[PDB]
Amino acid sequence: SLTGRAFAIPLRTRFRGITVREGMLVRGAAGWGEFSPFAEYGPRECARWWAACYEAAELGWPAPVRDTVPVNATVPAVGPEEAARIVASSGCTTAKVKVAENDVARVEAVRDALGPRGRVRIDVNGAWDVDTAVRMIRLLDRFELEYVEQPCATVDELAEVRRRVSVPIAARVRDAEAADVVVLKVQPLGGVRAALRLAEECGLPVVVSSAVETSVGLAAGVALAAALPELPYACGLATLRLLHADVCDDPLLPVHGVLPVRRVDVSEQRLAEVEIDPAAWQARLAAARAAWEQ
């Protein structure tokens, strides 16, 4: 519709299992919001994704305490040579390296491209069992890891891994001694305000990451990072680079390792090029909204 449009954008390579980013853009009084939960999430889970979209489109975000936010490079599971080029071209001194999608060689290459002063984090997306996580982290440890994100699927597993490794683990989680850092993603958490509340309640240092959104969704991620007390860790919001296209003429692409805190303007021409019939997505959005309001 005029105010609710669906998109389908191919990524440049498979990342966390996906190769095509789909979702809806909704226009409200405050601007545009993005509702892009991955296919597997049911209405009860999607309810929070919609809440984030609604906040962005109709409510606005809490005022920022900083005008720019530091970002890290997101390196997908590509060859070590390509990984280095991505890092060298990122303009960022922190890089997240995807593993468990040549994993060791990729991390080595990234550390080499960044030099001794760079920061290297690992993205496992909960693919390892406890024992595999311990042996892989040990192998990757010689590259000096800032932290390893979600090595295992559950809290009990994260807790056991944490007892046996000497690198911080990113995921109450603190009460279970399952994490050193908590990763915040605006959409699944229900918006900037909801994410800010969790940041306080979790009682642990936090880092902001994205759900590989278009610039509309990333703008909300930047608003969250811009409203947090502090950012000891670079934010994983430089993911627009993983997509072949965006829905804005002035995309949220990092320069000098940072992103500006600003709203984005959806471009008719850009959106139309990646637009799809919204019927199915509108039905899905309706179910999520129903779950949220109830």
Swiss-Prot record:
SUPFAM superfamilies per UniProt: Enolase C-terminal domain-like
Consequence recorded when altering residue 16 to A: 7.7-fold decrease in catalytic efficiency. 71-fold decrease in catalytic efficiency. 166-fold decrease in catalytic efficiency
Gene3D superfamilies (UniProt xref): Enolase-like C-terminal domain
Substitution effect: residue 236 to A: 3.6-fold decrease in catalytic efficiency
Active site: 98, 185
Effect on the protein of changing residue 74 to V: 1111-fold decrease in catalytic efficiency
Binding positions (Mg(2+)): 123, 149
CDD domains recorded: OSBS
Keyword Lyase tagged: yes
Gene Ontology MF terms in the entry: magnesium ion binding; O-succinylbenzoate synthase activity
Pfam family name, one: Enolase_like_N
PROSITE patterns: MR_MLE_2
Known function: Converts 2-succinyl-6-hydroxy-2,4-cyclohexadiene-1-carboxylate (SHCHC) to 2-succinylbenzoate (OSB). Does not show N-succinylamino acid racemase (NSAR) activity with N-succinyl-L-phenylglycine as substrate.
Listed name of the protein: o-succinylbenzoate synthase
Taxonomic source organism: Thermobifida fusca (strain YX)
Classification lineage: Bacteria, Bacillati, Actinomycetota, Actinomycetes, Streptosporangiales
